[PDB]
Coordinates of C-alpha atoms and ligand atoms in Angstrom, one line a residue:
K4 CA -97.1 -28.9 -18.9
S5 CA -94.8 -30.8 -16.5
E6 CA -93.2 -28.4 -14.1
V7 CA -90.8 -31.0 -12.8
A8 CA -89.7 -31.7 -16.5
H9 CA -89.4 -28.0 -17.3
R10 CA -87.0 -27.3 -14.3
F11 CA -85.0 -30.5 -14.8
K12 CA -84.3 -29.6 -18.4
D13 CA -83.5 -26.0 -17.7
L14 CA -81.2 -26.5 -14.7
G15 CA -79.8 -30.0 -15.4
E16 CA -79.6 -33.0 -13.2
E17 CA -76.6 -31.8 -11.1
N18 CA -78.3 -28.6 -9.8
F19 CA -81.6 -30.3 -9.7
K20 CA -80.5 -32.8 -7.1
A21 CA -78.8 -30.0 -5.2
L22 CA -81.8 -27.6 -5.2
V23 CA -84.2 -30.4 -4.3
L24 CA -82.0 -31.5 -1.4
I25 CA -81.7 -27.9 -0.1
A26 CA -85.5 -27.4 0.0
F27 CA -86.0 -30.6 1.8
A28 CA -83.3 -29.7 4.3
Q29 CA -85.0 -26.2 5.0
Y30 CA -88.6 -27.6 5.2
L31 CA -87.8 -30.5 7.6
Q32 CA -84.5 -29.3 9.3
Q33 CA -84.8 -32.0 12.0
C34 CA -84.8 -35.1 9.6
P35 CA -81.6 -37.0 9.2
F36 CA -79.3 -36.7 6.2
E37 CA -79.7 -40.1 4.6
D38 CA -83.5 -39.9 4.7
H39 CA -83.6 -36.9 2.5
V40 CA -81.2 -38.2 0.0
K41 CA -83.5 -41.1 -0.5
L42 CA -86.4 -38.6 -1.1
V43 CA -84.3 -36.5 -3.5
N44 CA -83.1 -39.5 -5.6
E45 CA -86.8 -40.7 -6.0
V46 CA -87.8 -37.2 -7.0
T47 CA -85.0 -37.0 -9.6
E48 CA -85.8 -40.4 -11.1
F49 CA -89.5 -39.3 -11.3
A50 CA -88.4 -36.1 -13.2
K51 CA -86.7 -38.3 -15.8
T52 CA -89.9 -40.1 -16.5
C53 CA -91.6 -36.8 -17.3
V54 CA -88.8 -35.4 -19.5
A55 CA -89.3 -38.6 -21.6
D56 CA -93.1 -38.2 -21.6
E57 CA -94.8 -35.2 -20.2
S58 CA -98.2 -36.8 -20.2
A59 CA -97.0 -39.8 -17.9
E60 CA -99.0 -40.2 -14.6
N61 CA -98.4 -37.6 -11.9
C62 CA -96.1 -35.5 -14.1
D63 CA -98.7 -32.8 -14.3
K64 CA -98.7 -32.3 -10.5
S65 CA -97.2 -28.9 -9.3
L66 CA -93.8 -28.8 -7.5
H67 CA -95.5 -27.9 -4.3
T68 CA -97.7 -31.2 -4.5
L69 CA -94.7 -33.3 -5.5
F70 CA -92.4 -32.0 -2.7
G71 CA -95.1 -31.8 -0.1
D72 CA -96.0 -35.4 -0.6
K73 CA -92.5 -36.7 -0.7
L74 CA -91.8 -34.8 2.4
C75 CA -94.8 -36.0 4.4
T76 CA -94.0 -39.7 3.7
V77 CA -92.1 -39.7 7.0
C90 CA -99.1 -29.9 9.5
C91 CA -100.0 -31.9 6.2
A92 CA -103.7 -30.8 6.3
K93 CA -104.6 -32.2 3.0
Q94 CA -105.0 -28.9 1.1
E95 CA -101.8 -28.0 -0.7
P96 CA -102.3 -24.2 -0.7
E97 CA -102.1 -24.2 3.0
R98 CA -99.7 -27.2 3.4
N99 CA -96.8 -25.2 1.9
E100 CA -97.5 -22.3 4.1
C101 CA -97.3 -24.5 7.2
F102 CA -93.8 -25.4 6.2
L103 CA -92.6 -21.8 5.7
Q104 CA -94.0 -20.5 9.0
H105 CA -92.5 -23.4 10.9
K106 CA -89.0 -22.6 9.7
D107 CA -86.7 -22.2 12.7
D108 CA -84.1 -19.6 12.5
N109 CA -82.4 -21.1 15.5
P110 CA -83.3 -24.8 15.0
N111 CA -81.2 -25.9 18.2
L112 CA -79.0 -28.4 16.2
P113 CA -75.7 -29.5 17.6
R114 CA -72.9 -27.1 16.6
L115 CA -70.7 -28.7 13.8
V116 CA -67.3 -29.7 14.7
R117 CA -64.5 -29.7 12.0
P118 CA -62.5 -32.8 12.0
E119 CA -58.8 -32.7 11.2
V120 CA -57.6 -32.0 7.7
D121 CA -56.5 -35.6 6.9
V122 CA -59.9 -36.9 8.2
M123 CA -61.7 -34.7 5.8
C124 CA -59.3 -35.2 2.9
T125 CA -59.7 -38.9 3.2
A126 CA -63.5 -38.7 3.2
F127 CA -63.0 -36.3 0.2
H128 CA -61.3 -39.0 -1.9
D129 CA -63.4 -41.9 -0.4
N130 CA -66.9 -40.6 -1.5
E131 CA -66.8 -37.1 -2.9
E132 CA -70.4 -36.9 -3.6
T133 CA -71.7 -37.6 0.0
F134 CA -69.0 -35.5 1.4
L135 CA -70.2 -32.4 -0.4
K136 CA -73.9 -33.4 -0.4
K137 CA -73.7 -33.5 3.4
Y138 CA -72.2 -30.0 3.3
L139 CA -75.3 -28.5 1.5
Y140 CA -77.4 -30.6 4.0
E141 CA -75.9 -29.2 7.2
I142 CA -75.8 -25.6 6.0
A143 CA -79.5 -25.7 4.6
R144 CA -80.7 -26.8 8.1
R145 CA -79.1 -24.0 10.1
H146 CA -79.8 -21.3 7.5
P147 CA -83.4 -22.2 6.2
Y148 CA -83.7 -18.9 4.3
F149 CA -80.4 -19.2 2.5
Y150 CA -80.2 -17.8 -1.0
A151 CA -80.5 -21.2 -2.9
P152 CA -78.5 -20.5 -6.1
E153 CA -75.9 -18.8 -4.0
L154 CA -75.5 -21.9 -1.9
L155 CA -74.6 -23.8 -5.1
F156 CA -71.9 -21.3 -5.7
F157 CA -70.4 -21.7 -2.2
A158 CA -70.5 -25.5 -2.6
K159 CA -68.3 -25.3 -5.8
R160 CA -65.7 -23.1 -3.9
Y161 CA -65.9 -25.8 -1.0
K162 CA -65.0 -28.5 -3.5
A163 CA -62.2 -26.5 -5.1
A164 CA -60.8 -26.0 -1.8
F165 CA -60.4 -29.6 -1.0
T166 CA -59.4 -30.5 -4.6
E167 CA -56.4 -28.1 -4.4
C168 CA -55.4 -28.3 -0.7
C169 CA -55.6 -32.0 -0.2
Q170 CA -52.9 -32.6 -2.8
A171 CA -50.7 -30.0 -1.3
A172 CA -48.0 -30.9 1.1
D173 CA -49.1 -28.9 4.2
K174 CA -52.9 -29.7 3.7
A175 CA -53.6 -27.7 7.0
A176 CA -51.9 -24.6 6.1
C177 CA -53.9 -24.5 2.8
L178 CA -57.4 -25.7 3.7
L179 CA -58.0 -23.9 7.0
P180 CA -57.7 -20.3 5.5
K181 CA -60.0 -21.1 2.7
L182 CA -62.6 -22.7 4.9
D183 CA -62.4 -19.9 7.4
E184 CA -62.9 -17.4 4.6
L185 CA -65.9 -19.5 3.2
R186 CA -67.6 -19.6 6.7
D187 CA -67.5 -15.8 7.1
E188 CA -68.7 -15.2 3.6
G189 CA -71.7 -17.5 4.2
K190 CA -72.8 -16.1 7.4
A191 CA -73.1 -12.6 5.7
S192 CA -74.9 -13.9 2.7
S193 CA -77.5 -15.6 4.9
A194 CA -78.1 -12.5 7.0
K195 CA -78.3 -10.3 3.8
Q196 CA -80.8 -12.8 2.3
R197 CA -82.9 -13.1 5.5
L198 CA -83.4 -9.3 5.4
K199 CA -84.7 -9.6 1.8
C200 CA -87.3 -12.2 2.8
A201 CA -88.5 -10.3 5.8
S202 CA -89.1 -7.1 3.6
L203 CA -91.3 -9.3 1.3
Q204 CA -93.4 -11.4 3.9
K205 CA -93.7 -8.5 6.3
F206 CA -93.9 -5.6 4.1
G207 CA -94.9 -6.6 0.5
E208 CA -93.4 -6.3 -3.0
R209 CA -93.7 -2.7 -2.9
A210 CA -91.3 -2.3 -0.2
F211 CA -88.9 -4.8 -1.8
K212 CA -89.2 -3.2 -5.3
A213 CA -88.3 0.2 -3.9
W214 CA -85.3 -1.3 -2.3
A215 CA -84.3 -2.8 -5.6
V216 CA -84.6 0.4 -7.8
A217 CA -82.5 2.3 -5.2
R218 CA -79.7 -0.4 -5.0
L219 CA -79.7 -1.0 -8.6
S220 CA -79.7 2.6 -9.7
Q221 CA -76.6 3.3 -7.6
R222 CA -75.1 0.2 -9.1
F223 CA -76.3 0.8 -12.7
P224 CA -76.5 4.7 -13.1
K225 CA -76.0 4.3 -16.9
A226 CA -79.1 2.3 -17.4
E227 CA -82.4 4.0 -18.2
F228 CA -85.4 3.7 -16.1
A229 CA -87.1 1.1 -18.3
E230 CA -84.0 -1.0 -18.0
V231 CA -83.8 -0.8 -14.4
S232 CA -87.6 -1.5 -14.0
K233 CA -87.1 -4.6 -16.0
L234 CA -84.3 -5.9 -13.9
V235 CA -86.2 -5.0 -10.6
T236 CA -89.3 -6.9 -11.7
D237 CA -87.3 -9.9 -12.7
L238 CA -85.1 -9.7 -9.5
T239 CA -88.2 -9.5 -7.4
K240 CA -89.7 -12.6 -9.0
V241 CA -86.4 -14.4 -8.1
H242 CA -86.3 -13.5 -4.4
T243 CA -90.1 -13.9 -4.2
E244 CA -89.8 -17.4 -5.4
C245 CA -86.6 -18.2 -3.2
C246 CA -88.2 -16.9 0.0
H247 CA -91.4 -18.9 -0.7
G248 CA -89.5 -22.2 -1.0
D249 CA -89.7 -22.3 -4.9
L250 CA -86.0 -23.0 -5.1
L251 CA -86.1 -24.7 -8.6
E252 CA -88.1 -21.8 -10.0
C253 CA -85.8 -19.4 -8.3
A254 CA -82.5 -20.6 -9.7
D255 CA -84.1 -20.9 -13.2
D256 CA -85.2 -17.4 -13.3
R257 CA -81.9 -16.0 -11.8
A258 CA -79.8 -17.7 -14.6
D259 CA -82.1 -16.2 -17.2
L260 CA -81.7 -12.9 -15.6
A261 CA -78.0 -13.1 -15.6
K262 CA -78.2 -14.1 -19.3
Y263 CA -80.1 -10.9 -20.1
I264 CA -77.7 -8.6 -18.2
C265 CA -74.7 -10.1 -20.2
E266 CA -76.7 -10.0 -23.6
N267 CA -77.5 -6.2 -22.9
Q268 CA -74.3 -5.2 -21.0
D269 CA -73.7 -1.9 -22.9
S270 CA -77.2 -0.8 -21.8
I271 CA -76.6 -1.6 -18.1
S272 CA -73.0 -1.2 -17.0
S273 CA -69.4 -1.4 -18.0
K274 CA -68.0 -3.5 -15.2
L275 CA -69.8 -6.7 -16.3
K276 CA -67.3 -7.8 -19.0
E277 CA -65.1 -10.1 -16.7
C278 CA -68.3 -11.2 -14.9
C279 CA -69.9 -12.4 -18.1
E280 CA -67.1 -14.7 -19.1
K281 CA -67.1 -16.9 -15.9
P282 CA -69.0 -20.1 -15.3
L283 CA -72.7 -20.0 -14.7
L284 CA -72.7 -20.0 -10.8
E285 CA -69.8 -17.5 -10.7
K286 CA -71.5 -15.3 -13.4
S287 CA -74.4 -14.5 -11.1
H288 CA -72.3 -14.1 -7.9
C289 CA -70.0 -11.8 -9.8
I290 CA -72.9 -9.4 -10.9
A291 CA -74.3 -9.5 -7.5
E292 CA -71.0 -8.1 -6.0
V293 CA -70.1 -5.7 -8.9
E294 CA -68.8 -2.2 -8.2
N295 CA -71.0 0.8 -8.9
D296 CA -70.7 2.1 -12.4
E297 CA -69.7 5.6 -13.0
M298 CA -72.4 8.3 -13.2
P299 CA -73.2 9.5 -16.6
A300 CA -71.7 13.0 -17.3
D301 CA -73.9 16.1 -17.2
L302 CA -76.9 15.1 -15.3
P303 CA -79.6 17.7 -14.9
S304 CA -81.1 18.6 -11.4
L305 CA -84.2 16.9 -10.3
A306 CA -86.0 20.2 -9.7
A307 CA -86.8 20.4 -13.3
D308 CA -89.0 17.3 -13.7
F309 CA -90.1 16.9 -10.1
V310 CA -90.7 20.5 -8.8
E311 CA -90.5 23.1 -11.5
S312 CA -92.6 21.2 -13.9
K313 CA -96.4 22.0 -14.4
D314 CA -96.9 18.4 -15.3
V315 CA -95.8 16.9 -11.9
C316 CA -99.3 16.1 -10.5
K317 CA -100.5 15.1 -14.0
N318 CA -97.8 12.4 -14.3
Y319 CA -98.2 11.4 -10.7
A320 CA -102.0 11.0 -11.0
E321 CA -101.6 8.4 -13.8
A322 CA -99.4 5.9 -11.9
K323 CA -98.2 7.2 -8.5
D324 CA -95.7 4.4 -7.8
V325 CA -94.2 4.7 -11.3
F326 CA -93.7 8.3 -10.9
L327 CA -92.3 7.8 -7.3
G328 CA -90.1 5.1 -8.8
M329 CA -88.7 7.5 -11.4
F330 CA -88.0 10.0 -8.6
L331 CA -86.1 7.4 -6.5
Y332 CA -84.3 6.1 -9.7
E333 CA -83.1 9.6 -10.6
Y334 CA -82.1 10.4 -7.0
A335 CA -80.3 7.1 -6.5
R336 CA -78.3 7.6 -9.7
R337 CA -76.7 10.8 -8.5
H338 CA -76.0 9.5 -4.9
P339 CA -73.9 6.4 -4.6
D340 CA -72.7 7.8 -1.1
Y341 CA -76.3 7.7 0.3
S342 CA -77.6 4.5 1.9
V343 CA -80.5 2.7 0.5
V344 CA -82.4 3.4 3.6
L345 CA -81.8 7.1 3.3
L346 CA -82.9 7.2 -0.2
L347 CA -86.2 5.5 0.7
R348 CA -86.7 8.2 3.3
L349 CA -86.2 11.0 0.7
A350 CA -88.5 9.2 -1.7
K351 CA -91.2 8.8 1.0
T352 CA -91.0 12.5 2.0
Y353 CA -91.6 13.5 -1.7
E354 CA -94.5 11.3 -1.7
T355 CA -96.2 12.6 1.5
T356 CA -95.7 16.2 0.0
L357 CA -97.3 15.2 -3.3
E358 CA -100.3 13.9 -1.7
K359 CA -100.8 17.0 0.2
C360 CA -99.9 19.4 -2.7
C361 CA -101.6 17.8 -5.7
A362 CA -104.9 18.3 -4.0
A363 CA -104.5 22.1 -3.5
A364 CA -105.4 24.9 -5.7
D365 CA -101.7 25.8 -6.5
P366 CA -99.6 22.7 -6.0
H367 CA -96.5 24.5 -7.4
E368 CA -96.4 26.9 -4.6
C369 CA -96.9 23.9 -2.2
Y370 CA -94.1 21.6 -3.3
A371 CA -91.7 24.2 -4.3
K372 CA -89.5 23.7 -1.3
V373 CA -89.8 20.0 -0.8
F374 CA -86.1 19.4 -1.6
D375 CA -85.1 21.6 1.5
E376 CA -86.9 19.1 3.6
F377 CA -84.3 16.4 2.6
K378 CA -81.3 18.3 4.1
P379 CA -82.0 17.4 7.7
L380 CA -82.5 13.7 6.8
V381 CA -79.3 13.3 5.2
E382 CA -77.1 14.5 8.2
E383 CA -78.8 12.1 10.8
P384 CA -76.9 8.9 9.7
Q385 CA -73.8 10.9 9.0
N386 CA -73.7 11.8 12.6
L387 CA -74.3 8.2 13.7
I388 CA -71.4 6.9 11.7
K389 CA -68.9 9.7 12.6
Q390 CA -69.5 9.5 16.3
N391 CA -69.4 5.5 16.5
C392 CA -66.4 5.1 14.4
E393 CA -64.5 7.7 16.4
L394 CA -65.3 5.6 19.5
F395 CA -64.5 2.2 17.7
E396 CA -60.9 3.3 17.1
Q397 CA -60.5 4.3 20.7
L398 CA -61.8 1.1 22.1
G399 CA -61.0 -1.7 19.5
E400 CA -63.3 -4.2 18.2
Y401 CA -63.4 -6.3 21.4
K402 CA -63.9 -3.3 23.8
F403 CA -66.4 -1.7 21.5
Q404 CA -68.6 -4.9 21.6
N405 CA -68.4 -5.0 25.4
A406 CA -69.4 -1.4 25.7
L407 CA -72.4 -2.1 23.4
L408 CA -73.3 -5.1 25.5
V409 CA -73.9 -3.4 28.8
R410 CA -75.5 -0.4 26.9
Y411 CA -78.2 -2.3 25.1
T412 CA -79.0 -4.7 27.9
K413 CA -79.9 -1.8 30.0
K414 CA -82.1 -0.6 27.1
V415 CA -83.9 -4.0 26.8
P416 CA -82.9 -6.8 29.4
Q417 CA -85.9 -8.9 28.4
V418 CA -84.1 -10.0 25.3
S419 CA -82.2 -13.4 25.9
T420 CA -78.5 -13.5 26.5
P421 CA -77.5 -15.4 23.4
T422 CA -79.4 -12.9 21.3
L423 CA -77.8 -9.8 23.1
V424 CA -74.2 -11.2 22.8
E425 CA -75.0 -12.2 19.1
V426 CA -76.1 -8.7 17.8
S427 CA -73.5 -6.8 19.9
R428 CA -70.7 -8.7 18.3
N429 CA -72.1 -8.1 14.8
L430 CA -72.3 -4.3 15.5
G431 CA -68.6 -4.4 16.2
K432 CA -67.9 -6.0 12.8
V433 CA -69.6 -3.1 11.3
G434 CA -66.8 -1.0 12.7
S435 CA -64.3 -3.4 11.4
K436 CA -65.7 -3.4 8.0
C437 CA -66.9 0.3 7.4
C438 CA -65.2 2.6 9.7
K439 CA -61.9 2.1 7.6
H440 CA -63.9 3.5 4.5
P441 CA -63.8 7.3 4.0
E442 CA -66.8 9.4 4.5
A443 CA -68.1 8.8 1.1
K444 CA -68.4 5.0 1.4
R445 CA -69.3 5.1 5.0
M446 CA -72.9 5.7 4.8
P447 CA -74.1 2.9 2.4
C448 CA -71.8 0.5 4.2
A449 CA -72.7 1.2 7.9
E450 CA -76.3 1.9 7.5
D451 CA -77.1 -0.8 5.3
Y452 CA -75.1 -3.4 7.3
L453 CA -76.7 -2.0 10.4
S454 CA -79.9 -2.9 8.7
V455 CA -79.0 -6.6 8.5
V456 CA -77.9 -6.9 12.0
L457 CA -81.0 -5.4 13.6
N458 CA -82.9 -7.9 11.4
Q459 CA -81.2 -10.6 13.1
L460 CA -82.2 -9.2 16.5
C461 CA -85.9 -8.8 15.2
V462 CA -86.1 -12.4 13.7
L463 CA -84.4 -14.0 16.7
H464 CA -86.7 -12.1 19.1
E465 CA -89.7 -12.9 16.9
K466 CA -89.4 -16.6 18.0
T467 CA -89.9 -15.7 21.6
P468 CA -91.1 -12.2 22.2
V469 CA -90.1 -11.0 25.5
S470 CA -90.0 -7.2 25.0
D471 CA -93.0 -5.5 23.5
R472 CA -90.7 -2.5 22.8
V473 CA -88.6 -4.4 20.3
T474 CA -91.6 -5.9 18.7
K475 CA -93.2 -2.7 18.0
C476 CA -89.8 -1.5 16.6
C477 CA -89.7 -4.5 14.2
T478 CA -93.4 -4.5 13.1
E479 CA -93.5 -0.8 12.3
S480 CA -91.8 0.6 9.1
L481 CA -88.5 -1.1 8.5
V482 CA -87.1 2.0 7.0
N483 CA -87.5 3.6 10.4
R484 CA -86.2 0.6 12.2
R485 CA -82.8 2.2 13.0
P486 CA -84.3 5.5 14.4
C487 CA -86.8 3.6 16.5
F488 CA -84.0 1.6 18.2
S489 CA -81.8 4.6 18.9
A490 CA -84.4 6.1 21.2
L491 CA -85.0 3.1 23.6
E492 CA -83.3 4.4 26.8
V493 CA -83.0 2.2 30.0
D494 CA -85.9 0.1 31.0
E495 CA -86.5 0.9 34.7
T496 CA -89.7 -1.4 34.8
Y497 CA -87.3 -4.5 34.8
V498 CA -86.5 -6.1 38.1
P499 CA -83.1 -7.6 38.7
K500 CA -82.8 -11.4 38.5
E501 CA -81.7 -13.3 41.6
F502 CA -78.1 -14.5 41.6
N503 CA -77.4 -17.8 40.0
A504 CA -74.3 -19.5 41.2
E505 CA -74.0 -21.8 38.1
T506 CA -74.0 -18.9 35.7
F507 CA -70.7 -17.6 37.1
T508 CA -69.0 -20.8 37.7
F509 CA -66.7 -22.0 34.9
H510 CA -65.6 -25.4 33.9
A511 CA -62.1 -26.9 32.9
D512 CA -63.2 -27.1 29.1
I513 CA -62.5 -23.4 29.0
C514 CA -58.9 -24.3 28.2
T515 CA -59.7 -26.3 25.1
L516 CA -61.9 -23.7 23.7
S517 CA -60.4 -21.3 21.1
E518 CA -59.8 -17.6 22.0
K519 CA -62.9 -16.6 20.1
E520 CA -65.0 -19.3 21.7
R521 CA -63.5 -18.3 25.1
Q522 CA -64.2 -14.5 24.8
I523 CA -67.8 -15.3 23.9
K524 CA -68.1 -17.0 27.3
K525 CA -66.9 -13.8 28.9
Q526 CA -69.2 -11.6 26.9
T527 CA -72.0 -13.9 27.9
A528 CA -71.2 -13.5 31.6
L529 CA -71.0 -9.7 31.1
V530 CA -74.6 -9.7 30.0
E531 CA -75.6 -12.0 33.0
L532 CA -73.8 -9.6 35.4
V533 CA -75.9 -6.4 34.2
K534 CA -79.0 -8.4 34.3
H535 CA -78.2 -9.2 38.0
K536 CA -77.4 -5.5 38.8
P537 CA -78.8 -3.0 36.1
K538 CA -77.6 -0.1 38.3
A539 CA -74.0 -1.1 38.3
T540 CA -71.3 1.6 37.7
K541 CA -69.2 1.3 34.5
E542 CA -66.0 1.1 36.9
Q543 CA -67.4 -1.8 39.0
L544 CA -68.3 -3.7 35.9
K545 CA -64.7 -3.8 34.5
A546 CA -63.5 -4.7 38.0
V547 CA -65.6 -7.8 38.0
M548 CA -64.8 -8.7 34.3
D549 CA -61.0 -8.2 34.9
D550 CA -61.1 -10.3 37.9
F551 CA -62.7 -13.4 36.4
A552 CA -60.4 -12.7 33.3
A553 CA -57.4 -13.4 35.5
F554 CA -58.9 -16.5 37.1
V555 CA -59.6 -17.9 33.6
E556 CA -55.9 -18.1 32.6
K557 CA -54.5 -18.5 36.1
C558 CA -56.5 -21.5 37.1
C559 CA -56.1 -23.1 33.7
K560 CA -52.2 -22.5 33.9
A561 CA -52.1 -24.5 37.0
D562 CA -51.6 -28.4 36.9
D563 CA -54.8 -28.8 39.0
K564 CA -56.9 -26.8 36.5
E565 CA -60.4 -27.6 37.7
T566 CA -59.4 -27.5 41.4
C567 CA -58.7 -23.8 41.6
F568 CA -61.8 -23.2 39.6
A569 CA -63.9 -24.4 42.5
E570 CA -61.8 -22.4 44.9
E571 CA -63.2 -19.2 43.3
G572 CA -66.8 -20.0 44.3
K573 CA -67.0 -16.7 46.3
Ligands
LIG601 C1 -70.9 2.0 12.1 C2 -70.8 1.1 13.4 C3 -69.6 1.5 14.3 C4 -72.2 0.9 14.2 C5 -72.1 0.7 15.6 C6 -73.3 0.7 16.6 C7 -74.2 2.0 16.3 C8 -75.5 2.0 17.1 O1 -75.6 2.7 18.0 N1 -76.5 1.2 16.7 C9 -77.9 1.2 17.3 C10 -78.6 -0.2 17.0 C11 -79.2 -0.9 18.2 C12 -80.3 -0.5 19.0 C13 -80.7 -1.1 20.1 C14 -80.1 -2.3 20.5 C15 -79.1 -2.8 19.9 C16 -78.5 -2.2 18.6 C17 -78.8 2.3 16.8 O2 -78.8 3.4 17.5 O3 -79.6 2.1 15.9 C18 -74.3 2.3 14.9 C19 -73.0 2.2 14.1

């Protein structure tokens, strides 16, 4: 059994070289590009000697030992069981690498015709460094779209008018995938398979309400294996198991969903990406109420005593089928309440009288997120995306001013994008959009704060139950124990480079200074904050509009 030969023959050389490069760029993010390509080539040539003869020397070594040794040719404490854990824990979610600049379209198109491999290979390299938890088989799909964009646009007349829209759309699609995937790995490493499996049975039951529980259970167990391998660095094992899972869904389509026909006729990488973004299938007609099998039955505690989690999974499956308008987080709350009740009632002398009114306890839990979305969307339309982000900046920096300024401006801008993405939807699609998107933005705050814990209040909010992560953050309130920071003249002084920056890069500078102003005066009236912001907003365009640009900038020193 040669694991390096098994993965090579299942994935093929092209994906093998790509998946091995990604793993190296995520384990050693600070190592240069050309050094990793030399390691990947040597690895790929070694896999060829093992597909020919599986009994050749070192072919029996595991992928962890092979990749660990090849990496440490440049934390490597002998034993491989712990050496792979040193690499995973030292992954830097903000590795402090230089921000990538995009050259002109003719500079990139010439590099695309010159050497197409190293141009696209360096694309997978630079991305895997910045996003060390990126869904590996999903990054191969983004690479193909990044190649088709240059293949089509560089032969077009106006190459810039063609390439820039497709590259800007790909950039935003990638940042969202990385955020969604980082959440999947946090729920596994910090909460276990049970937490992730429950998430999977809820999201898939809404997506596949036609499928039976055994069909959903098989998909969930296989999908958990894929993401457990992908989050633990087993990228070759991850992309192999994902392809086999996509083959099963397509060879058993009528047992899963009806919106899988056009997905199962695309190429391999498109096939898996198509199923991950498929619309929720229609609910089967005439579904009985859950009270018959979960409350009004005399065999509720009998079936629950055999396998509690399997019974709880059936309850979550049956409840998630009938409510595609509920968020996954809400569906986990209704399933945990039904669990707490069964634990109390199945030990009593009359469990039927005890859990007869458990479904009434779900009614208050449903209306809590419905009030969160309706109130904030009504304020989003009145403010606009840019004013909604600024109002969230001053509000949340008063709740927790210990969090660093780049983190506060980061998660506040992403909450404005939740209003731009979900508030347009009706009240039906508002809850699974907003509450689940709100889950991945808070996960950014948690992870970015986990690197340097400054506020113990946020840490307790992240370390507790992730299902209760949104309600714990609502009840923070202003932190009066924090003392205002002394005024720094360099944080308010601007540079002449503010002209060359884009409007989005220039408005981030202004949202940064807003956070530094509230950290200097936490007890600042909402009227006095807009007066200081609008005053510097005038000096940003007025001083740049003059011939002596940087000269008038210094004149505003007081
Ligand atoms: C649907 C959108 C308009 C969205 C906008 C923000 C709003 C919200 O208030 N979120 C906070 C999260 C938080 C807590 C503390 C610090 C930083 C963020 C919470 O209350 O959980 C929820 C809906």
